[PDB]
Swiss-Prot record:
Keyword Ribosomal protein set for record: yes
Function: Binds directly to 23S rRNA. Forms the L1 stalk. Unlike the case in the Thermus thermophilus 70S ribosome, this protein is not seen to block the exit path of the E site tRNA. It is clear that the protein in the structure is flexible however, so this is probably due to its position in these crystals. Protein L1 is also a translational repressor protein, it controls the translation of the L11 operon by binding to its mRNA.
PROSITE patterns attached to this UniProt entry: RIBOSOMAL_L1
Cellular component GO terms held in the UniProt record: large ribosomal subunit
Similarity comment text for this entry: Belongs to the universal ribosomal protein uL1 family.
Disulfide bonds: none
Species classification: Bacteria, Thermotogati, Deinococcota, Deinococci, Deinococcales
Subunit structure: Part of the 50S ribosomal subunit.
A GO molecular function held by the record: tRNA binding
Record flagged with keyword rRNA-binding: yes
Pfam families: Ribosomal_L1
Organism per entry: Deinococcus radiodurans (strain ATCC 13939 / DSM 20539 / JCM 16871 / CCUG 27074 / LMG 4051 / NBRC 15346 / NCIMB 9279 / VKM B-1422 / R1)
Stated name of the protein: Large ribosomal subunit protein uL1
Amino acid sequence: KRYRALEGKVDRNKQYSIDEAAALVKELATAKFDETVEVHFRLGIDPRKSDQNVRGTVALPHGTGRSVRVAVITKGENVQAAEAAGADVVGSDELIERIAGGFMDFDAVVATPDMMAQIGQKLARLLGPRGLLPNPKSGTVGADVAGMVRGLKAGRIEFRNDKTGVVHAPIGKASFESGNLSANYQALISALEGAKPGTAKGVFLRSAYLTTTMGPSIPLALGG
RNA sequence: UCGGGUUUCUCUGCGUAGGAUAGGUGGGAGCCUGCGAAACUGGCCUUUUGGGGUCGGUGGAGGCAACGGUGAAAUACCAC
């Protein structure tokens, strides 16, 4: 159990908005190690059609307690511009053997302009239908594997949708401040309520709830 | 008796592989002694293919997830 002195201070009938929940989120987590509290939203527009899934990304503010994940595949003057920085698993053309041998937990596997065919002639039989490839309009295309892979540096990417009616993206950690849990919360209603491709209904935001390693939830308010 | 709603309580979810239905994210490695995990017999619920609960004989009480297995995710520990 262990449900008091952290839920006794919790009532699921009042409010705790932006400048208030931020000074009461790192609190409701007197459990074990570092404890992050989720930020819940509800995509319940119409959860059973192909044009209601948010097929886009989000970019976290500062620097989380994590790192940077990008398995580059390059050759030439792109190896010293991709190993002397801090990406992930970089070498040469043998990165088709590191992503077809027995491990695919890597992220945005980059390439080279004239070497896109390395992830299109050799890894379009396996890595083809994975939706994690470099193309000339989305993530990282061209010789931009040092400037806009910084969108994979300063911002936890993440792209997912479901079949029920719950969508909750993380802020990172609570190992910061009471003005930085609401600074990470200025990029979640700033990069997640913009999914309107084909058809939708009326009124989007309704309320908000929470989640930890021992809860709980004080319904977050909304406004200016 | 019927019409439904709301709220407390109650759980099915195998087109794929994956030993045993993972239902989702974060703390993804810890505590749990304070709120439905093992399968011998003519089963209800999923339908006499395997699988949570069983009514009772039958009678190892400490563990599991995982590296592996594995996939845009994994079978457990805490909640929405």
